[PDB]
Design a protein that fits this description.
This is part of a larger assembly, with three copies of chain A and one copy of chain C. Chain A is of the alpha+beta class. Chain A contains six helices and 16 strands. Chain C has one domain. The chains are: A alpha+beta, C mainly beta. Bound molecules: sinefungin (SFG) (2 copies). Chain B: It is found in: Cytoplasm; Nucleus; Chromosome; Golgi apparatus.
Chain lengths: 318, 306, 296, 318
């Protein structure tokens, strides 16, 4: 909806980071001698209402470099905003494309592809699948902004959140479905039981012959207090370009950036944990041609059931 | 007594089935794909290996696939391998074999629990279960005593543990327990309990008491030889057979003939002898027959008219 | 003489006069059996109409070995260890013994230095020492905790052999000791004793690394499991490495690559250096190809 | 499963009809003078365990014409049966292809495409979508067997079947979901209230620029008795080639063919119908990129609710 895009646009830190990354990449690709002749092809993949298109334009003026823009957007309602901005302000420099980036036949190849397809668990909005499908129209020496992203997990204790998740039981569905799905939540009345550890990583472009976005991770969390495990908090980190990053992981959290709250992966049954014990968790990223999903289980100090098997309770549509 | 023959070598399906039926067996546990035929699913040129991938479903009638055959997972399939390439080829091969079993309409399929970490095996099995209905059983092959715990003390610089480890002697029960907890107590997942030459201490055995044991695997190697040269069992092994007969488990004979002078059917003849000579059931056991673990609503003769 | 040779070639071994012994299995289709073949003209292999001798086995061939100049010792799927022999004319391969002693597939076999004894390894986790003249098992060892992958008899030490298993152990054996085995990351899959240095051996792993052990030097040679390791007949030997990655590599003393072949379209199963021309190396694979490599 | 294919194979009438159609088409494409030189490319699309492959071979021997066969099958378990038949009996004349017909890159173009992708309501197994995806590898003058299919509907009264459908309520789903899905059923204790009328038709090949498999049909059923409407019985008819057909519509039912039982489309609420009144029904065939479904409603003598809106209770996976 229009107001979800408006909410994204209220975060100036996120766009100033994207602009700084594009500004740095343009200077590395085009030297001073070529500044007036060399026109860099830039494709904003998932342009929304256009704040990244404006960030790329400000970056090019800052870098004193020439750019040719393509603004790709599948949402036809956001395309209304885009085509009105293009006609009134952008002009011929910007070509608005109403298409899925995976289906789009590009007239030219891109020097830089820019996107913001990241969820609170980084890859949970299917940024790897989208970018993999758009990869073919990027030049051989082409750059993807973001270049990389990494998700993080941390075990948490919160009897309040366990009670909140429990209350999400619904009519006409599995009576325990609410425990087998993640929740975006500003975690408040909780306790982080161990330091966050990396879970899944993705790189762009994906210069690998055996492209597989499926993953299986085993995490060992040392616990120093007696407690109850109610779930896992998820965060992410991303490399836009070189040293220009974005983070929601608490120890490296990007100052004043509110675009993403943490994610919560619940467990069906609370697990007693003694001081000195290790929490062991297993997370899987799974897929088929139509859906992507997560599966998870605790194997230590005690076993849980495998949560969300075959994406029976929660899926991310392709 | 319901008996099955376990084999890992089937040159011809019809001839093997026929020889096994002639011995007096009710069923055959066998590989559904050649146990040495490792398959590649990602890397060229081996992923493009010309077919057929296995033998035809047309070699047996549908009734024979449904009643006489228990399927077996290929021994190279290692979903919990530390090598990613081995893990991914193993996941794809596990699905392919389980799917071929479902295609055949097999009544049961054997999967081993031969190590502590079977998390990914559990995950691949749970996903298979949540793809259709099938009703088909999964028999988890788990020994009373782990192979690391029954090895000969013949490694001079790595001796066997001569210290009693109460909870450690019970390690295979924990392998089963974690597996079935991960799989969320599926009614389709049961135990195929493998009996060893030396029975563990009582505590280790009765850990399995209220567990869903559907089969008991008897290696030919655990049998002693009597005066006439026939295969027999120790008195303690006989005690365990009688407890397993009370649970109505299916008995599986595995391994080669270790009593060469005798016909192989002598292992089964002995088992059938023990079944025939089991302690008889009392008037209560006779009345209760058919009601074993069958749940009923307690009668309310005050509230209802009987 | 079988009308057709099975697709999945498992073994290739040259004897002294340069005649090539082949081992094959059918790992798919109706019948899962095997065959043994002799080719006095190795160029003619695997053509059935151009063999010196050929025979059908009961089950598949997982491994084989020459026993002198006329003996063929076979590791079978049936759990049997079989001994075959060429007749006086070497026009027939005849069975001498077939002893079913293993409880599962016999995966590996090796002749000890005496030439009168053999060692077998199996998926049943047991290692067996055989007396070839008496056709009996002298010793059965349950030292491992998982499937036995490879057994390699010492070149000149009669009572010495190496074993490796999925239990992650490489065991050095000496049957003269009351406790015969001694233990010496990624699972070991292939073994080869150095032909000149009595205390040296190479081992391959499930991840493609080949390592030099002087009872260390390692090289990431393959992208997949190292199936086999074969030393050349030279005064200064070269080492042939074969893998499930479908390639053959020829390595020097310091495990550095000298030759590479992507000739096979499926898994490379055996490698055998010609006694006639020491620069020639024959490989067999599951693609049914018998390739003759000219190693530089 | 293997036994479902075995059950299909028990119907000799169906394969003898396919053989007769292929036999007739081969004589029309290749005259006597060309019989020894002209080799017709035949592609069996969805070959199963191979009975259509054998029917095409018997047809070619009958016609005294030369054929080159491709046996396309997506089910890898059926491909085991196929590749064993090919090696043992068929030989080089048959090329077994383990692929979805919509994804397959064909080495040659086909003179004839043969398939049996029909459900009890003809197009309910998605034969139009499958054949549309395979259409490109058929020669310009190429023939599809079947050439056409038509579904039929008839209003029915059956208080027993209404009770049977009602009893299909399940835990963890919409309490009325069972009324919003079709059922394959050998209708016995029922009353057909009006003669069957055509519902949806499909033709192959689809030589139309605006290919749309979506449909909307309005059917007017004159009723001559006082009764209760509990649902609609569905049947189909197909043209294999010229006069060679297959039918489950009762008035034209193919003699001795048992491969398909009728289909039942229930209604949530029984509808009183007076003698002389017209039953009016509306059926829609709907789709998206992932699913196909039916929607239906009674508008006369009284309105029903729209059944299965957006495929909430029943979908056919693409
Ligand atoms: N595969 C795809 N092809 C085209 N656009 C996509 C695709 N996947 C997601 N999008 C769009 O990408 C956008 C993602 C937004 N969350 C971000 C909007 C905008 N770039 C911003 O930073 O405000 C949405 O407008 C989606 O509709
Ligand atoms: N798009 C597709 N690509 C390939 N095969 C398909 C496709 N859709 C369905 N099939 C197969 O077509 C077959 C349809 C069967 N009901 C008929 C089997 C067989 N032709 C017979 O008449 O017995 C199945 O074996 C399906 O797996």
């Amino acid at each position: 909806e229009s107001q979800t895009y408006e909410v994204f646009e209220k975060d100036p830190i996120k766009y100033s980071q994207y602009q700084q990354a594009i500004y740095k990449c343009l200077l590395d690709r085009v030297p001073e001698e070529e500044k007036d002749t060399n026109v860099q092809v830039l494709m904003v993949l998932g342009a929304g209402r256009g704040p990244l298109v404006n960030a790329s334009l400000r970056a090019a003026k800052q870098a004193d470099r020439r750019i040719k823009l393509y603004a790709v957007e599948k949402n036809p309602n956001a395309v209304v905003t885009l085509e009105n901005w293009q006609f009134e302000e952008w002009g011929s420099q910007v070509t608005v494309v109403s298409s899925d980036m995976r289906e789009w036949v590009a007239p030219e190849k891109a020097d830089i592809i820019v996107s913001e397809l990241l969820g609170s668990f980084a890859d949970n909005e299917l940024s790897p699948e989208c970018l993999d499908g758009a990869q073919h129209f990027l030049k051989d020496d082409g750059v993807s902004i973001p270049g990389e992203y990494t998700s993080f997990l941390a075990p948490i204790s919160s009897s309040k959140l366990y009670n909140e998740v429990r209350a999400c039981r619904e009519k006409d569905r599995d009576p325990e479905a609410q425990f087998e799905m993640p929740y975006v939540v500003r975690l408040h009345n909780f306790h982080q039981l161990s330091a966050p550890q990396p879970c899944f990583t993705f790189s762009h472009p994906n210069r690998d012959p055996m492209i597989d976005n499926n993953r299986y991770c085993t995490l060992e969390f040392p616990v120093e207090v007696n407690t109850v495990l109610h779930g896992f908090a998820g965060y992410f980190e991303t490399v836009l370009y070189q040293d220009i990053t974005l983070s929601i992981r608490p120890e490296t959290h990007s100052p004043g950036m509110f675009s993403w709250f943490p994610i919560l992966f619940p467990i069906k049954q609370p697990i007693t944990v003694r001081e000195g014990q290790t929490i062991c968790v297993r997370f899987w990223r799974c897929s088929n041609s139509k859906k992507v999903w997560y599966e998870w289980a605790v194997t230590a100090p005690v076993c849980s059931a495998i949560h969300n098997p075959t994406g029976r309770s929660y899926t991310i549509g392709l | 007594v319901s008996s099955g023959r376990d084999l890992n070598c089937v040159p011809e399906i019809a001839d093997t089935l026929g020889a096994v039926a002639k011995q007096g067996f009710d069923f055959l546990c066998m590989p559904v794909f050649h146990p040495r035929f490792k398959r590649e699913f990602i890397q060229e040129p081996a992923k493009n290996r010309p077919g057929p991938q296995t033998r035809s479903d047309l070699l047996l009638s549908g009734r024979d696939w449904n009643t006489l055959i228990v399927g077996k997972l290929s021994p190279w399939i290692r979903p919990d391998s530390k090598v990613e390439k081995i893990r991914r080829n193993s996941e794809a091969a596990m699905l392919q074999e389980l799917n071929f079993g479902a295609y055949l309409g097999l009544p049961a399929f054997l999967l081993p629990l031969n190590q502590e970490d079977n998390t990914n095996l559990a995950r691949v099995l749970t996903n298979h279960i949540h793809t259709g209905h099938h009703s088909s059983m999964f028999w988890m092959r788990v020994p009373l005593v782990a192979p690391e715990d029954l090895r000969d003390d013949i490694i001079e610089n790595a001796p066997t543990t001569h210290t009693e480890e109460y909870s450690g002697e019970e390690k295979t029960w924990m392998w089963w327990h974690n597996f079935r907890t991960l799989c969320d107590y599926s009614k389709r997942i049961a135990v195929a309990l493998e009996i060893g030459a030396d029975l563990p201490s009582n505590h280790v055995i009765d850990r399995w008491l209220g567990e869903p044991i559907k089969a008991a695997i008897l290696p030919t190697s655990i049998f002693l030889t009597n005066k006439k040269g026939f295969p027999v069992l120790s008195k303690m092994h006989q005690r365990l057979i009688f407890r397993l007969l009370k649970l109505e488990v299916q008995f599986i004979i595995t391994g080669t003939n270790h009593h060469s002078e005798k016909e192989f059917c002598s292992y089964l003849q002995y088992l059938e002898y023990l079944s025939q000579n089991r302690p008889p059931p009392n008037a209560y056991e006779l009345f209760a027959k058919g009601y074993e673990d069958y749940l009923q609503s307690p009668l309310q003769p005050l509230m209802d008219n009987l | 003489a079988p009308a057709c040779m099975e697709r999945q070639l498992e073994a290739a071994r040259y004897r002294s006069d340069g005649a090539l012994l082949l081992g094959a299995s059918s790992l798919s289709g109706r019948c899962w059996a095997g065959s043994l073949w002799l080719f006095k003209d190795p160029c003619a292999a695997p053509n059935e109409g151009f063999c010196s001798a050929g025979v059908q086995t009961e089950a598949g061939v997982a491994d084989l070995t020459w026993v002198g100049e006329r003996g063929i010792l076979v590791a079978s799927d049936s759990g049997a260890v079989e001994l075959w022999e060429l007749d006086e004319n070497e026009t027939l391969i005849v069975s001498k013994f077939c002893k079913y002693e293993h409880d599962d597939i016999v995966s590996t076999v090796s002749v000890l230095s005496s030439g009168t004894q053999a060692v077998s390894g199996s998926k049943d986790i047991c290692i067996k020492v055989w007396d070839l003249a008496q056709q009996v098992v002298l010793s059965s060892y349950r030292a491992h905790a998982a499937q036995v992958t490879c057994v390699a008899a010492s070149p000149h030490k009669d009572s010495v052999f190496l074993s490796c298993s999925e239990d992650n152990r490489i065991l050095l054996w000496d049957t003269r000791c009351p406790k015969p085995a001694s233990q010496i990351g990624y699972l070991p899959t292939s073994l080869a004793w150095h032909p000149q240095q009595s205390e040296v051996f190479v081992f391959g792993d499930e991840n493609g690394t080949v390592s030099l052990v002087d009872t260390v030097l390692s090289s990431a040679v393959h992208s997949q499991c190292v199936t086999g390791l074969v030393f050349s007949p030279h005064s200064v030997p070269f080492l042939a490495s074969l893998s499930e990655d479908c390639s053959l590599a020829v390595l020097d003393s310091s495990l550095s690559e000298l030759f590479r072949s992507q000739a096979h379209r499926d898994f490379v199963r055996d490698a055998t250096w010609s006694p006639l021309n020491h620069s020639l190396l024959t490989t067999v694979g599951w693609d049914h190809q018998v390739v003759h490599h000219v190693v530089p």
